[PDB]
Amino acid sequence: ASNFTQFVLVDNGGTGDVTVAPSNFANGVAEWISSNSRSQAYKVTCSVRQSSAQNRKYTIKVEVPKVATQTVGGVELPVAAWRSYLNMELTIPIFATNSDCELIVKAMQGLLKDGNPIPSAIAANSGIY
Amino acid sequence: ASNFTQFVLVDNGGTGDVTVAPSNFANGVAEWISSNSRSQAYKVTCSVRQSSAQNRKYTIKVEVPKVATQTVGGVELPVAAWRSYLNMELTIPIFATNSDCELIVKAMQGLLKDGNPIPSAIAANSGIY
Amino acid sequence: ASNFTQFVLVDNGGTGDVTVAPSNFANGVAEWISSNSRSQAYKVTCSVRQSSAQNRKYTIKVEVPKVATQTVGGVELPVAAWRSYLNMELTIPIFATNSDCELIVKAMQGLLKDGNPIPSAIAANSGIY
Amino acid sequence: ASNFTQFVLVDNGGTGDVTVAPSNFANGVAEWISSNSRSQAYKVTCSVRQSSAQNRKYTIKVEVPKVATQTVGGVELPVAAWRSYLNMELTIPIFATNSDCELIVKAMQGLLKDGNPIPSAIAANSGIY
Amino acid sequence: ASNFTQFVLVDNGGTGDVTVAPSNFANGVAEWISSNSRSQAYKVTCSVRQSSAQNRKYTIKVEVPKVATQTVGGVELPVAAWRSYLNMELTIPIFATNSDCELIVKAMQGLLKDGNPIPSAIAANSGIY
Amino acid sequence: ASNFTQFVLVDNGGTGDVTVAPSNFANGVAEWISSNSRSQAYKVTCSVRQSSAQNRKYTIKVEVPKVATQTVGGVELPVAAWRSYLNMELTIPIFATNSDCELIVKAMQGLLKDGNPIPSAIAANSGIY
């Protein structure tokens, strides 16, 4: 066990799956990037710090690039036309059991399950109503 | 559409599921709450605004009760020993089409799929190693 | 479910019932007015805010108009000769269960039930003695 | 008349009713209390004065105990975690006849009838949505 | 009950219809936006406020994009080549009953009815002649 | 050929219809006024001008009178008790073809179509909720 492993970030059903792999842990920040140039890569980072005396805080970030090829100076360079940024902070009391922590993980994945309100809004460029 | 409905936040497989239902919409912030006192409820909120000239941000917040040794309906203090707080900000460029937003949603749910490192670190009360 | 619905404010037994309907929610204040001109309408507003860290506070207001027709500049305008103002604030601890909250609602309606002391005093232009 | 009598504040239909009885009249403020310690009692007070040259105000206050997980007769601290406070001010113009005051009472009890939005938001621990 | 919902802004047949869906209601400004890239989206907003003691004033705004692709340096972005901007202010005295408001609405839709002088001048890049 | 003609501003059935007929076209402002006393008349004006190098801007204005009789000193005059004032500005870039103008017109009439949120909020003295 070492949980610092590769995983598939975007499952496009076997074909065109975006999978991300361990790439750095300098300064206590675990980083995973996809197999692209650093200019076009998906990136995921994660770090935990004991924020208060009684809390721990996980900070997770995801960058999703829209790839493009730009001509700069008559030369074509692999580029990301824009990136989208997910940025999440989770603060957990030190008194939380592993069963308590599993509840948090289940709530977070239920939140984004296909068909529930929030994933639907995002995917439609809509708000909730 | 009409996104604002009840949904299952924690799926404990049929029995013991936690459903969260619409409870407030003041200021266009959709709130969903579970059937509990506000001090012990699972609570979810979501809102969207154009954050900059080039971006929109979804702000999503979740609060999850510490359940081990909970006294249902009891007055449990300090509040911070008994609650976890999730805070997600998703910044999406105004150029993103719906297909782009679909992919962002898939990246978000891939991050948290069971077995992948971030959910299993959280659930095991751990960092990355 | 959306609890923002129309309701009858004054039940004059089917005939001359004053009924009030959703009319605004700007700034998180739910407003209902009766079907009159805005100068002669009954108005009801309601808003909830988390006042303290451990409290929530509901602020409910009702305006009851005494309608009249006034001649201003030789022209007759629909007007309210005076309005009566009910103004109530309810502060509930976050530790209150839904069964605890039902008790509050039952106490508030018992307070104003026909024949109990306070409704009798108001209706008679009397104090309590 | 003689308004100042006992009445049923919470009608749980015969069995489990909460009756509140006259308990103080210092300064012409009628107080009614239930049969409990003053820290756990249902308490009601009511007074009336001419607030301005044109108006009278009834000030009515209710305190309701948090009952889930209550220890009867116990010392429960903090007081604020265990109590809800209602505060109503009714301003009625000096022109209002008794019929007018009857209607104001009906508006007040319509606001709180079961099924109408404000009582059902409160009881469900919710805002308007 | 809610009027903050999705609706058809352009019935352009029953297929190329443009629909606008609720997006944000911050600060008393209801905003609706069509789907896909916000950069090419139609936008409608509406807000009502008591402009004077006697008047309420609605401000309604609509933006109609000309859809296009910007290509700069080989990078293509979905953009609006330009937008037409409708902006309208409707002032209504508080003495208007609901029937007077219906008439104001019929005047507005008569003004723009198909075949009448103003809609057909606009539709033809033309003035009055 | 002429579009400066009489037209129906309110089809209020096929009988109480309000028709507005050309009155004056001085200084590039087309004005139409309904018949009988100018004091109780509906008024519509429209003017188009090149607001910028790239834009033409239509200004359309409508006034809806509440008909009434002023009686002062025993002398009665037909007056408008008050007027609602619609004022709209539509900016269209010179690149719009006639088809783009038709679409702008369909957006305008969709906005005010019967049953959609803005016309029905106005019609009911209401905001968005």
UniProtKB/Swiss-Prot annotation, chains A, B, C, D, E, F:
Keywords: Capsid protein, RNA-binding, T=3 icosahedral capsid protein, Translation regulation, Virion. GO terms for molecular function: identical protein binding; RNA binding; structural molecule activity. InterPro entries: Levivir_coat, Phage_RNA-type_capsid. It is found in: Virion. It comes from the Viruses. GO terms for biological process: negative regulation of viral translation; regulation of translation. The keyword Transferase does not apply. GO terms for cellular component: T=3 icosahedral viral capsid. Residues 31-104 are annotated as: Viral RNA-binding. Homodimer. The capsid proteins form dimers that assemble by group of 5. Twelve such pentamers are linked together with free dimers. The homodimers binds to the viral RNA via an operator hairpin, but also to many other RNA sequences in the viral genome; this interaction probably shifts the virus from the replicative to the assembly phase and ensures specific encapsidation of the viral genome. Belongs to the Leviviricetes capsid protein family. Capsid protein self-assembles to form an icosahedral capsid with a T=3 symmetry, about 26 nm in diameter, and consisting of 89 capsid proteins dimers (178 capsid proteins). Involved in viral genome encapsidation through the interaction between a capsid protein dimer and the multiple packaging signals present in the RNA genome. The capsid also contains 1 copy of the A2 maturation protein. Acts as a translational repressor of viral replicase synthesis late in infection. This latter function is the result of capsid protein interaction with an RNA hairpin which contains the replicase ribosome-binding site. This is Capsid protein. It comes from Escherichia phage MS2 (Bacteriophage MS2).
